[PDB]
């Protein structure tokens, strides 16, 4: 309501003004020539009893 002088972006009350958000998460992932489970990929598999 009453604020000394003209209104600015710092003049709203609590929580009246939200800022701008990018509503997601940017993921950083390891980079390489081989797959992530590189040693797992090369092997063959045999069952055990």
């Amino acid at each position: 309501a009453t604020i000394a002088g003209l209104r600015g972006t710092g003049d709203w009350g609590n929580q009246e003004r939200p800022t701008d958000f990018r509503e997601t998460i940017l993921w950083m992932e390891p980079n390489g020539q081989a797959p992530l489970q590189a040693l797992m990929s090369k092997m063959s598999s045999q069952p055990t009893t």
Binding site: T9, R17, P18, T19, D20, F21, R22, T24, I25, L26, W27, M28, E29, P30
Partner: protein, 50 residues
């Protein structure tokens, strides 16, 4: 808005840094703050070397 923001997260190793020297027979380790929350019962850890 005159202010904008964004979030980022990184998938990487789980590392902890010791803070005080520990003898060979002490079972409690001091680490940097909030790092101990990452581990739970049953985890296997190994000492790093150059």
């Amino acid at each position: 808005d005159p202010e904008f923001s964004w979030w980022e997260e990184k998938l990487t190793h789980n590392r902890l840094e010791v803070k005080t020297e520990a003898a060979a027979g002490v079972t409690t380790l001091a680490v940097d703050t909030d790092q101990a929350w990452a581990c739970v019962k049953g985890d296997i850890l190994m000492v790093e070397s150059v």
